[PDB]
């Protein structure tokens, strides 16, 4: 009886895995977003630094 009850309780958290998956993938997309922003900023500043140094 109690083993079955334990399985029933374990069912409740049966979704957490996909919650984790979603969090990870979404935040990875956010990572790509943010790094793209920082990289474009970097490139523009570098390109203008070229001419400043000139």
């Amino acid at each position: 009886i109690d083993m079955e009850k334990s399985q029933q309780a374990l069912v409740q958290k049966r979704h957490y895995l996909f919650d984790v998956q979603r969090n990870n993938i979404a935040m990875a997309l956010e990572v790509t977003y943010r790094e793209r922003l920082h990289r474009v900023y970097r490139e523009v500043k570098n390109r203008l630094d070229y001419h400043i140094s000139v």
Binding site: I25, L29, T32, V40, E43, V44, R47, V54
Partner: protein, 62 residues
């Protein structure tokens, strides 16, 4: 302050120079050679991308 002829000497050499500044007077082709070498080296340190636009990326997703 003009009492020291050195100041006026430097000053009007300077002036004549600025008037000649229509071009860099007496640059000498070695000037241009130095420019060439160092400008390349600077560019390679800065890469080979055309220094005129916003090099496009078309960023790649997972």
């Amino acid at each position: 302050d003009p009492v020291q002829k050195l100041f006026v000497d430097k000053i009007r050499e300077y002036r004549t120079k600025r008037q000649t500044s229509g071009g860099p007077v007496d640059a000498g082709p070695e000037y241009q050679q130095d420019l060439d070498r160092e400008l390349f080296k600077l560019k390679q340190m800065y890469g080979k991308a055309d220094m005129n636009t916003f090099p496009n990326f078309t960023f790649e997703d997972p």
